[PDB]
Amino acid sequence: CYGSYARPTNSNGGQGVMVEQNGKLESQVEMQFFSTSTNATNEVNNIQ
Amino acid sequence: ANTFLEEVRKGNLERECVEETCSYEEAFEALESSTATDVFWAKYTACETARTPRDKLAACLEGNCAEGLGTNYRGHVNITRSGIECQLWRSRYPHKPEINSTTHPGADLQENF
Amino acid sequence: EGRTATSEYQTFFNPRTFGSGEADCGLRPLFEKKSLEDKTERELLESYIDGRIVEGSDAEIGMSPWQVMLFRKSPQELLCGASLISDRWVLTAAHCLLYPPWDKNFTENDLLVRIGKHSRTRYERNIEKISMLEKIYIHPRYNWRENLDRDIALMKLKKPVAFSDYIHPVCLPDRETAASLLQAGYKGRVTGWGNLKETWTANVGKGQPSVLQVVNLPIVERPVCKDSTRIRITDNMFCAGYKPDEGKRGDACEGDSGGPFVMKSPFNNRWYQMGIVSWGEGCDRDGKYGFYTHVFRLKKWIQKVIDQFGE
Ligand SMILES: [Ca+2]
Ligand SMILES: [Ca+2]
Ligand SMILES: [Ca+2]
Ligand SMILES: [Ca+2]
Ligand SMILES: [Ca+2]
Ligand SMILES: [Ca+2]
Ligand SMILES: [Ca+2]
Structure with a gap:
């Protein structure tokens, strides 16, 4: 982290590579989810 | 649970889930061997009256004595109070048990113990 | 072996109420009427190879005519096995019918029987037959309180089933015949589907x-x-089977409870059923053999049943 820079792309200072997909219009940002292991191991409770 | 900076030190199953009211998470974290985890859980549960003092929980871990109604007993005595042979819990001879190994697998149902 | 010395079958029961065709007990038209020997007969002599325990083997087609499968009428559930003694009487284990501690108390109208079955889960319409029980006799000497002594139960079918290749009664040995066969050193045969x-x-x-x-x-x-x-063992029950050496448990718990224990008699080319496959220590405890209930002495008793129906 000490000395690591990456230029902004959007107007609102959010870094992210603008991939060429039907053009440079779209940004590829994925979402990932996580829940408690132990606490939600044996059981299920829809593992919210 | 207490001594907040415990989660950075290495831990002791006996310095977390014995000498202290613990999370089954730290229990789960420290145990992983989920079979013995269930065993330790069964312990905790039965030892719900053996939470204190420490040596009481140690004995409840030994398991030679039945706690309360006898949910925790894990000895080798397989004889009735009057010397009658104990029937196999899982087997249907001579009675088909509605309450048997399938219904109570967590009690470690031995041969006829 | 029997050569020019044929031991004829002596009719101990009157055909009127014990049923016709008594002289043709245990004679399969596919095997006995053509002198065809099954592939599993070469092991009958107890002088076989060092008495090593033989695993379970699948039986041929039509070689088990005296086997009966006692089924639950409602709902669908296999209950036990049974032995075919005559075209209008069947023999089954008493514990399969009455066991108040087992929550099992069956009347005559709550169980059925199936004879000549090949596969339990399938239905082969033409060759197999079904029957519904009407009358049940229980021997007063059946003692289930101490050692399951004399596990005997008799059943009568309302609609008779005629003779066929896959359905045929087995012969009944007497005291002298049983002694002669047992002192001859011949292995016994147990048929079933693993319901025991x-x-x-x-x-x-x-x-x-x-x-x-x-x-x-x-x-x-x-x-x-x-x-x-x-546990004490009466004379009416006997041991049979190889000794299961340490490291493995024997196959004494194979087949169906209440089924037959038959031996092919070398003196008349017939199959004699020594008794009933009853409960033994071979199932519940390792290192044990099959315990079987003797019914060979009951000849005089048998007529005592049908003497009630001689009207
Ligand atoms: Ca965790
Ligand atoms: Ca702590
Ligand atoms: Ca803690
Ligand atoms: Ca501490
Ligand atoms: Ca932790
Ligand atoms: Ca910890
Ligand atoms: Ca300590």
């Missing part, structure tokens, strides 16, 4: 065979039979 293992054991890992299964078991010594159990 399901009923009396919780051993999961060997699924219940839906195919007709046969096991050959010889006899052992009677005093050793007494020493092989912590």
Whole structure:
């Protein structure tokens, strides 16, 4: 982290590579989810 | 649970889930061997009256004595109070048990113990 | 072997109420009427190769005519096995019918029988037959309170089933005949579908065979039979089967409870059923053999039943 820079792309200072997909219009940002292991191991409770 | 900076030190199953009211998470974290985890859980549960003092929980871990109604007993005595042979819990001879190994697998149902 | 010395079958029961065709007990038209020998007969002599325990083997087609499958009328559930003694009387284990501690108390109208079945889970319409029980007789000497002594139950079918290749009664040995066969050193045969293992054991890992299964078991010594159990054993029950050496448990819990224990008699080319496959220590305890209930002495008793129906 000490000395690591990456230029902004959007107007609102959010870094992210603008991939060429039907053009440079779209940004590829994925979402990932996580829940408690132990606490939600044996059981299920829809593992919210 | 207490001594907040415990989660950075290495831990002791006996310095977390014995000498202290613990999370089954730290229990789960420290145990992983989920079979013995269930065993330790069964312990905790039965030892719900053996939470204190420490040596009481140690004995409840030994398991030679039945706690309360006898949910925790894990000895080798397989004889009735009057010397009658104990029937196999899982087997249907001579009675088909509605309450048997399938219904109570967590009690470690031995041969006829 | 019997050559020019034919031991004829002596009719001890009157055909009027015991049923016709009594002279043709245990004679399969496919095997006996053409002198065809099954592939499993070469093991009959107890002088076989060092008495090593033989695993379970699938029986042929039509070689088990005296086997009966006692089924629950409602709902669908296999209950037990049984032996075919005559075209209008059937023999089954008493514990399969009455066991108040087992929550099992069946009347005559709550169980049925199936004769000539090949596969349990299938239905082969033409060759197999079904029957519904009407009258049940229980011997007063059946003692289930101490050692399951004399596990005897008699059943009568309302609609008779005629003779066929897959359905044929087995012969009944007497006292002298049983003594002669047992002192000859011939192995016994037990037929079933593994329902005994399901009923009396919780051993999961060997699924219940839906195919007709046969096991050959010889006899052992009677005093050793007494020493092989912590529970008293009457003379009406005897040991049979190989001794299961340490490291493995024997196959004494194969087949169906209440089924036959038959031996092919070398003196008349007939199959004699020594008794009933009753509960034994071979199921519940490792290191034990099959315990079978003797019914050979009951000849005088048998007529005593049909003397009630001589009207
Ligand atoms: Ca965790
Ligand atoms: Ca702590
Ligand atoms: Ca803690
Ligand atoms: Ca501390
Ligand atoms: Ca932790
Ligand atoms: Ca910890
Ligand atoms: Ca300590």
